[model samples]
Target chain A: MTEIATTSGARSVGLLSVGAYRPERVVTNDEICQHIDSSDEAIYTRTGIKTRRFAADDESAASMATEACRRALSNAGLSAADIDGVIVTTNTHFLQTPPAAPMVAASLGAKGILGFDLSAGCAGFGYALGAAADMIRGGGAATMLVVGTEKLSPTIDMYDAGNCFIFADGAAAVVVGETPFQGIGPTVAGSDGEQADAIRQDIDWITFAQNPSGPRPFVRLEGPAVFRWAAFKMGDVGRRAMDAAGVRPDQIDVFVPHQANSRINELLVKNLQLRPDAVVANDIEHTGNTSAASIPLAMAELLTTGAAKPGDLALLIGYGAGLSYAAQVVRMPK
Target chain B: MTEIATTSGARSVGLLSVGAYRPERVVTNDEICQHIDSSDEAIYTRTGIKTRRFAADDESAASMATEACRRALSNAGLSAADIDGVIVTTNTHFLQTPPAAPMVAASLGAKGILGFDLSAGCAGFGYALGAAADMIRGGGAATMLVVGTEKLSPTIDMYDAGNCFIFADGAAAVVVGETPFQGIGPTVAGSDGEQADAIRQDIDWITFAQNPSGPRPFVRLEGPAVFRWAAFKMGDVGRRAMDAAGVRPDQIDVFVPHQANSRINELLVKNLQLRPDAVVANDIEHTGNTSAASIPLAMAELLTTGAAKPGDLALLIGYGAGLSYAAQVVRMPK
Candidate 1:
């Protein structure tokens, strides 16, 4: 059934709860140093990642999402039965069939409800969060399970010193529905396919090669090229979102940037001129770059671990190789 | 800005207009018979599709989509400015980066507007239509464009007697929004990934095959099995959708079935007990089988050609290899 409520507007749409799921297995710089010919010190200094989690052989994008959904639902003190819609946001569901959303919905007992997969790559979580939040605000769905999940281990090439240890597998989920105070805000998402190859998979995941030529099945990133653009665009998107949502940069309590690169996040914080204490930063140094799961997963640990409380303001930001990025502001969680 | 307004809850979502696009080129049974070793009778009587459209050498899914979108928009007396969100329903987007949406959106001068491409194969258009209607009714946007375009010619094996000239290239678009009345009921959508292999494509397209010794690139299909399963399961799905949508069999004014095969659609029509005249049927009768674009493209022809008129009820039914299918009822334009 469809749930529509025009509940006092304030109680209709916002962040109800947040949760994160990282696989138990963590791969440290030392571990990578063992397999590849890279020094831990150089790797850590360059990418600012100390460790990252890799999905086990049995793990996949769908399974990671299932875990994230369970935790997010539980944090809201709700059951899987409570969700009415789902929006699975990621870029790696490159197969021709078997979309990940319905499968994830099925595991959550939300299969019968409305749901679909969204592709915005790393920025997916933030874009999806804002989109789902809008749907709730529009009274389309009362509760939606929005997930940003990716499996990077299988996608990355260990031979590529630039990206092998930087990406990881995980999902961060947030339930958007009636809650107090802070909620998702207006969003700005755009992409220029002209630069798609800058962040695209070098190898085809769905097809085998004729002569197994090139890096046929691994992630490729022109780091310097991508970061140059990401550094400029994400800030603009963040500023625009804050402006449109009628929030001030100074009034923002904390900025939770996508943990794709600590250096990138640091640059944004500096450019935005935010106080060091106002940024929620961590774990990418330990868990590696979790792609779409970065921000919310970090938010989950911070809020659930009692690091933050209700009524605090948060600005969620995300940017990815899709050359896609989205940002939004919300009153502190309640 | 989230400019949304939902009132008069009793006013349901309905179809504002419908349109379709097919390539000029047709690949006939005779041509296939000459090209391959297959006989015409085996191809025609068994699959019931004499021919289907094949996109020109230069045409792709997005190209067909542009045609379909423009046609539907024209018929609705609506331009790009009247459209809010667009959902491109297809499985064959060429690139991984810029989802065909932003590119299309920008071309339509809707740079910051919302759009997303779907990969649910044939059922994609049907699924997109129902979902877009939901988003419209909820006040997320005033008018939405939903098109399913597919260029499967590159992948379908013409020489393979099992499934040649069975898939076509085309695009179909429908504009649905919140109105006083005239759209689909709650559509039923599901997939038995359990039976995903029943209508399956291997994870290889660019490089279609793999051998321990060598590689090949020929598309393969289990024809007899797919035909049997498609007809039975698709009919069941149609009935289920009708029930979920609260539309009784008697309420359906027209049947728009996915153009996988004429035999299958005919069998499905018989199963629904719909009279021959009550259906808008065209298996591309000459172009081969179009993937996701089939149904909407068919609908566009039916509407623009003056074969259907305003307030006429029509049901769009879709089923594909995912073993995924979704169906909904919509009223034709005036």
Candidate 2:
């Protein structure tokens, strides 16, 4: 006997507010040069990164995420108790289970609400945004906290110049809720796992246990392959996201791609043919690539610095390990 | 000016089909007794687990999930090409980047789809089901594959009878798509991070790495605390799910709670006041506690054994790490 219930419609979902947090410590290329053979000039010439933030010994992805959520809740004019769900996107958490989101939620007094951690390489924040927006649209929750946080310093191979200079730590968050009109557009997302090796942490517990004192596994980045893919494929995805949102390139007031690096950001902006008047975020110069935290952190940077204003049309794109990528166009939160 | 696009509605989303995979090696209670200071009878009496499967040297969560997805696709009469999205739920995957779902999708020749991994303790499968259903309901995807897979063998503290005897490894899969009627109902989900210590990994990566020869961190279980929460809170959540679905306890043909333990299962069924005729899945007897993989694995068992027929009204409940819990009512897939 299959008597199934049905649904007709759900409320419109939108981005309500955004917030971000960077650790107190800042590490420059000169300091990083001590760990690797690369010089500051060469590193800046290659990645266009001058300085990046490093989390304090007491700080962690979840703790920083909690701070970011506090700011986001305050900005949204809502309390922690008012949130119905929490989604944290990150790949650098130390613990495998009892995910960081619930702990962050509980600290914020959002107990008795939905909470979970999501992983999609660097595209995780964008992927989570799609999930959170859909959850609201499907009436699964009223208000949701979406966070993109990373503590990549510990995960980065200190011996490798390519990694030590590029990876950093930070947290960013956004509040998602109902809107009279759509503030978030339909997401254009896909993965090419065949190239998953371009960026990955290929170590397992068994191997690590076999040689505990050996070099610990780190997040490996094959820079060239990743750059080629991002520069070539991401443009089409960004245009499709704008197309899906029915926003023209000229209407784009801000382009917030993942702060992967300065070069990729410049390439993406050129490929998408965004107007010079549209502000393209270059947060990587200071924040480095925070992986999943890149998009939201950059978005928060643009808004907080007045580089991009509320009610502007912004294009958000993210891509990284998993060979995963996602793009969406959104009306900036007021 | 904020000119935003809008959408009217989307099709009803529901379960399409399910599949499961267990490793070749079976570890009986007698075999486990060899590793710990426990008798087979005592172990069986306490956990009601006679035997559990352990992954072979070649198997990982992603590999097993690929196999499970192949079966699920065959059972659903669909192919990898037909899948537009993939979500894998697991806590045992050691790799932090390039998540398991995308790799599984690529192996199945299902590249270029939205893919991500979710972590919510044992409630991961339920959490992902809600996410996938919502994505489909919001027109984010046309069809999605949701996999709950884990390889707990590597993470288990072999010396600890409390953990080594209870945790196991396995993979399960389900395909979700639009239905003429609701196949999945509104979810009743919540978390209480206050009891986060009830079930969790007690140590972090830094500690484990520094003390590689010391003690590898394993999943810690405070059995009594977890038992109390699952029994009391989950029952209330189950009824809330039923109420949200407009389904009554008498109408449920199957009760599928997480295969946590026999006592919790019994207590939950009794707590829900489900009718005696309803098939209550006790897959734990053979599968042990596969965490995130439990619910779908139990569903696959019920379907494969003819204990519960297709199109049966089933109450699905999950609870564990993060002190998180979620429940929902669904028309079982054929």
Candidate 3:
């Protein structure tokens, strides 16, 4: 048998920096109530969302992701040339052929770099982070830019009271590269495909293409079902991630779960039995549910608002569409 | 700084088995000539495709990928339960929210597995293979099913002479797992995002959604531009992959470039200076261009026809939309 050689890479990899981009348009629950019968108080009580950023018509997933990547590069004190790969975890790029990753890379002036898009629902960032770390460890790349971007506004059905307020638009990113020590832990990620339909597009593009006049497809959500799954099942996943990282619950300085709902976060913190000192992220109060962008956006909020600092141990969990979820422990980036 | 722990995993990984699913409907150049202004001889002269497979209406990316994955698991003498992750490389799943991976995983009865969809144009399979290998090496998963599936017929414009007969549909998969020795070599992959528009959809989904009565979006191609890029530049990528794998061109037992065009394949083989004894795959002679599914399907053909034997070193290269390309070397699996 012929022998095959493999490349040797970094012993440990971690996030070097983080950046986020929130769109300029701030959509309030009062505005959303114009279409749906729900009021601002009712919406807040139901989803813990008072406001969310909505991209301007000219703004796109690629544009917003490029901005986030640019900021991330700046924060890392690296240029586009220093990045070897780009992975955009997005489900709302609006193209079925050319993915958003290459577009974002092109916009960043990154030249010829390995670029692609990943779709794992809201857990996309966690999955992309895990893949980037593994690629660095396996010598596939030395540095990778992982962006979680979503333009969920177009996919929203304003008339559909269940989802109109739940999904919003934003972009966030992290630069993953070699670290002196492990800054990223093993990602405990999985998908319950049996519940794939709990949050999904109401109709496929093909179906819509076949009948242009038919009701346009919109993102549909069974809010209670997703809430139950995230609150009950994700605690074990978070624990597994912490355990894999050799960190105890009490040692966690911050808990940044996907900003899907404030109630879910409350339940998760309780379920995991983290210390009272653990600063929990409540970005959903203003960011709504940005889907894939939620975790990184929430992380940015913590660092920017001084709720968390560099070197702090943060447990991150992301869950949503595809009924997918990924949890991991990592040190806060400078 | 707080220290984070990382996962320890296999030192090496390889392909355990391969499987492919070609749709039942065989579309010939003669049939395509009816819709486009091209003769059979001209079509064959331009592209090496004489016939391509068009999937039945009942067959989808998920359905085809599921069948391919099932066959791959059976060939590996493992059950779906043995798989811990599923990565579906595709661009034509036709949904924006819930990706096709979870659907495929559910169909296979593989529960609670890490499943996601990846989009890297025709180079999707190569990217997915590399990511899967790295995940295994990083202890992300013990066993992974990497599938490349595409349904191009629906995305094709029948009136377009350039692509009417050039695209097709199929699915292929490989079970990647721990190997005693390195069976899969390092992947040399990158994307030229500067040429992102060389091969892309004519319009985005949002654009189409905005004007439902307007022209529907279709996969567009700039043949001469893509031809020059793939034919001229990809040789270096292939050579780089071989070099990274510590394999010489003459030592390669097989060369399986994407089933894109025979002229491109001929140019690549000539430029690489491969040995005359090397079995070059010309699956495009019948398979057309299955994009992401091309490489694995070609590999399956080579193995099934006894043109290649287990333990033989095969060089694989894939390039397409995203103006993306990836090349790697792997020992053939039984």
Candidate 4:
């Protein structure tokens, strides 16, 4: 037998740097009204979004992921070759077999690394981060890149009143490496499949293709049901995350929940009884809901705008389709 | 501030038990020849597959995964309530939303668990197993269910000469738990994204849906290229895995490479220079390339046939598609 190969990984794990990419073309609420029968005020009053990004014809989850990863690598002061693994989180990746991760890695000039795609709905970013952090800390890889990217606009029925103005396209990435402190807290996550239909594509791709005569299947949401769950249940999960981190509500310097809707963020803050001084990220006001990309995208926005700083504790909670949710606390990356 | 809710976990991890579900509908080479121009002799000569299973309309990846999980749980002497997380590996799950893992969890009476899906083409099973093991060892979960299921028949273009006769459907699951010793050794995994197109679905589902008149996109493989990679490169990865485990080739009691092709397995065994007494799985003879489900399905066969006993040392490798590959050494589960 040849000499055994072994992988040496980080002794501790946490996000080392973060970056995000929103499409250049910003679609205003009025533009959404052009497709659906809704006024700008109605859209703003309901979902609290004034504008959102829409990918160009050439842009996709993989393309956007490549950009986000490049920026993240730059933020971490590392090169593409420094990455040992890539974990992409998304549901809108176009291809089936090759997956978005490898293609994204190749596009970023980070080929020949451990790469794969993960799907967990809007909770995907947290899902990928928790698992990736474990992999790094447990000797699977020394450095892992976790990206959340989505190209959901094309999949949504633009004419549907329930979903037309909500879903968007964007990508965000974080470079995770070793940390002396437990920068990431234990995750509190799970799924309730009974609510699987709360927010989901109506049918499978094959079924939709064969029955093309019918209106193309779109993301269908039980608005009130999902809102109630996200506003109520997610608050408890967030508190649990902070508790797991051995931090107090007041000690948390920022609250960066998934950018699903501004109203949901407001409700989560109120329910969690967070400190009034804590910075609350509502990137959804402009970015809309990019599913798995929401949390990291919001985090990048908060940090870039100087609202959150390195070493500050932040709570992140991701919840959506699969009726899945994952929450954890982390110290902001330097 | 409330008391912390930290989770503590085991230092060692391993598979507890495994189960597989091959759809009852058998598809013979003659059946395949009805669509594509091929003979039994030609097919068997190249791939060594006599028959494969095709999923029924009601037997999707989720449903099959549920059945496989039940048997795995039973074999592990565990119940749905014992599961804390669920990670499903597949490329053929039909829907892009509400990933199959959550639905599978609910069907198995295991709702309210951490559930998600992973996509890495044929190497998905090994990829998920590697990450899940790290999660457990790093304190993410006490016990988890890792499932590999695929419904590739629906995705295949029955008239496509290169793919029609090769793909099949099946599901296999394992109950992973803590062990006193490292039941699973270090994993050696990576991907060459420059070869991302070697084995993949030609286009994204949306692209295919819009171009409905065009032949439905199918799993396309540059056969000779993939065969060369699987036969040559994968053998080196397998030896590295054995080395990571600090086990010699002669000490390995069983070898379970992804059941992609019979000839690939023969070449790998030869290259690894395994002891003649070691058992090498070839479940592909009847299962075809079930992709992500192949490794666990092959293992189930070996255990069922008494070819491998519990606690015996085994080397497992999965490689394909993204040009992704993951290899590890493990103690056979009871």
Candidate 5:
């Protein structure tokens, strides 16, 4: 029997590079006042958001993914073609038929690589990363690029001040491959679609309708219900990931929760009792809520600030619109 | 010692139930003539199509996927919760968020079962099927639902007679698992995004453009260019698959080639020297070019007609769009 070679029992699917993007255009509550009939104070009190990044008319998944992918590929000292597969995790691709990754790949001139889109809402980024790691370990891949990017603004009905301030555009990229310190621990992912409607608006499901129908649809939310669900589930997802990896709360070097709301992130970090500075908190604050791009963007910011240290252990927890959630743990820079 | 699973040289995973869906509404060339500026004769001459299915206004990736999935679930004799994953393969998911599978899992009441959307353009169906089988054998999954679906009509600029008779809508579901029977073979999935100009028209690849509002886009394809490329590669992909399965042309009981063009399907069968009746064909004549939904819908139709028997070998091939293509061989009733 010929035993296939591997980074068998790979010590880590290391995080090699990091980059993120936030649309330069920011929609502040003060400015939003000029549009729909609402006050910043009113919307602020309602959703705890000060501003959101609205993608320019042209912002899309592929372009944003390209920005992030380029940074990742470059940092890994590889070209787009060197990466075997690409997984784009997003909430909005904003295309008629082009899936996000292909658009991203096309722009990068990495046309020969196999790429696919993975959508699980906000949890998608973590889901794609973990999935890529597993695929690599299984020998189905050698190098992989996982990007979480979105142009939520395209799906927005900006008239809804509650949404316009909280939703934003952003993209994040990370390279995961077989190497020492590729410390991806056991991951857990799932969706409670039974409670699917509890967080969305009536039009959010979009069963059928034609184009030229205007924005993806209305922004819907049962805020209180979603808050309850997310608060409990996101916290649990984080702890369980720690538990599965046999890492204690203190053993964790950082906590990166989905940038849904300040409260959700803070509460989980406080509950986990991780090192205050090590935890990447409020990284989403300036970006507003970028959906899927949140974590990778935070990591990029973390790397920029010299916050990430080699051999450090970190955790990422996410929960959102699938009524879906995912938790992942990976070691820091090699 | 626990034997670790590896994708290379591992016992390939198999399939359980193969199911499919074509929309309730079948639009004939005469019906299209009522709107588009042409009639049955013109469409037949131009596209080799007389009729095609379009998802009902209330249909989508989620809805059609549910129908096909329910049948597949029943065929597999498993509870909704039994499936570990649901992979929805398509380019048209009604919502810009979630890509219709999480909602698909919800509608099927397969809550907690993970579902994801994969984009390989028209070749998406075959690519996802192969990926799912690999994931299962690699132990990333137990049972999975691989559904190729699309509702391309929404992108139709009704006045464009050029495509009114060519594109279509439908969904197909296949239950993939670790079972016996020549379920799935090596997948030769590749793309030449450089040839992207051959088929791509709705290029929404840019995000956060410094300037917006640059192009008026619609789903357009360079038909002649895409056709010639597809015909040549479809055969090459098919041949490689048969080679991987180590089977002779006569051993393959049926063939399911991407139903891009009816003429092309006939061309492939003749080119492969596959026996006329022994191979699966003709769904394209009615389904027109259902894009990703083509091949599976035909396979599902054949299964319904008992044209496919247990223990018979089948060659599954797909191409077109993304300039991507993939082919695999499987055993019937697998």
Candidate 6:
């Protein structure tokens, strides 16, 4: 038999730097109330979002991702040529063909690189992070740019209170490369596909295509169902991630969960019995739920504000859509 | 800094089994010519596709992928319970949110597995194959079901001569697991995002949503440009894959390039200078171009027809859409 030769890879891999981009337009809950019947106080009480960004007509998932990637490259002190791959995790790129990753790569002047789009809903960033680390560890690429960008405003149903106020637009990116020390921990990831309906598009594109004048397809969310799953099930996932990383609750300096809802975050923090001093990310208060972009956006906020410093032990958890979840522990990047 | 503990993975990993599902409905070039100005002979001469499968309205990407995955699992002498993850590669799953991977996982009774959708145009499967192998090599999962599924009938533009007859629908999957010998070789992958417009949607989804009465979004192709790129550039990719695998062209028993076009395949073979007796895949003669699913579908065909067998050294190359490409060599799976 002809023996196949495999490639050798880095012994350790982790995030080197992080960057984020929030659309310039800050939309207040009161502004959303114009299309849906809800008070700003009621919205905040339920979802913990005061303001969120919405992209301008000129901005898109690819554009936002390019901007975030630019910042990430800058922070990492790397040029576009240093990046070997680009992975864009998004569900709102709006085109079914020629994924947004290539567009973003081209925009970054990083054209001749491996680029692709990965979709696992809001857990996308976590999944991409794990995949990028593994890719480096397995000798696929030396440097990978992972971007979680969402232009959810286009998919929002303004009349639907359940989704419109919760989903927003933003992008965040991180540069994953070889590290002298193990900086990224094992990822605990899984999906409950039986609950795929918990967060999904209201109508398939073909159905909408068949009825052009019919209601447009919008992202639909079953809030209670998702909340129940995240509140009850995610704690175990978080614990497993910590265990896999040989990390304990008290040792964690920061908890960065997906900015899905303040209530879900609170429940997770309580269930995990984390230290009171552990800074739990509340970027949702200002950034809202950017779906796949939430975790890194929140991570950026933490690092930028000094709430979490570089080298801080951070536990990250992401959940929603696909009813999928991924968690890991890492030393915060500069 | 707190130390992060990383996971350990298998010493070697490779494809364990392969399976495929082509829709029952056969669409001939003659049948497609009814909607456009082209003859069956002309189409065959230009593209090398005689007939292709079109899924019934009841056969969705998720369902087809589920079927393919089931067969792959069965062939691998495993059950759904043994598979720990599913990485679906496709661009035609329709819904933007709640990706098709979870739905496929649910259908296969493989819930709670790590599942996600990846898009890189027709190169998706090649990219996913590399990712899955790396994931296993990095201790991400014990067994991964890598599926390339496409339901492109809905996205076909009946009036467009450039794309109407060139694309089709099918699903194919492989079970990847740890192997005592290196069965999968290192992947040579990269994308030309500068040519992002070469294969793209005619219009973005938001534009279609806003102009409901306008022409619906359809996959478009710049055939000559793509053909020129593939014909002139792919030989180097194939050589790099073979070189990375430490295999000579003469040692290769089979060549499984993406089933894009017969002319392109002919050029690639001539350029690569494989042995005269090498079994080159011409599955496109009957399968058309199923995009991401094409390579695996062709692999299944070669194995099933006895043109290739388990342990045979095959070079796999996938390119198109995203203007992306990935090439690798592997020992054919059972």
lDDT of each: 0.67, 0.87, 0.90, 0.86, 0.70, 0.91
Question: What TM-score number comes out for model 5?
Answer: 0.86
User: Candidate 2 — what's its lDDT?
Assistant: 0.87
State the lDDT of candidate 5 residue by residue for B43-118, as single tens digits: 7866778888887776776788888888888877877778888888887764555446677888877677666677
Question: Which candidate number would show the highest lDDT if scored against the true structure?
Answer: 6
The DockQ figures for the candidates are 0.23, 0.73, 0.82, 0.61, 0.28, 0.85
Model 2: DockQ vs. true structure = 0.73
lDDT of 1 at A123: 72
Per-residue lDDT tens digits for candidate 6, residues B265-305, read 99999999999999999999889999999999999999999
Q: Give the distance in Å from residue B16's predicted Cα in candidate 6 to where it truly belongs.
A: 1.1
Per-residue lDDT of candidate 3, residues A4-119 (tens digit): 99787887888899999999999999999999999999989978899999999899988999999999999999999999999999899887777678778888887688878999
Order by lDDT, highest first: 6, 3, 2, 4, 5, 1
TM-score of chain A of each: 0.91, 0.96, 0.98, 0.95, 0.88, 0.98
DockQ of 3: 0.82
Off by over 4 Å in 6: none
What CAPRI-style quality would you assign to candidate 2?
medium
Model 4 Cα shift for residue B147 (angstroms): 0.6
True contacts kept of each: 0.13, 0.71, 0.80, 0.70, 0.29, 0.82
Report how far off residue B138 is in candidate 3 (Å). 0.9
How far is each candidate from the true structure, as Cα RMSD in Å?
Answer: 5.2, 1.4, 1.0, 2.3, 4.7, 0.9
Which regions in candidate 4 have their CA more than 4 angstroms from the true location?
A1-8, B1-7
Candidate 6: TM-score?
A: 0.99
Chain B in candidate 4 has what TM-score?
0.96
TM-score of chain B of 1: 0.88
On the 0 to 100 scale, the lDDT of residue B227 in model 5 is 76
Q: Compose the digit string of candidate 4's lDDT tens values, residues A1-334.
A: 2222334466557789998999999999898899888999998989999999999977888899999999999999999888889999998886777877888888878788888899999998898998888778767788889999999988888778887899999999999988776677887788889888998878787786676565565678787888988988998898778877777888888898888878888988888888889899979999999999999999898899999998778899999998999999987886
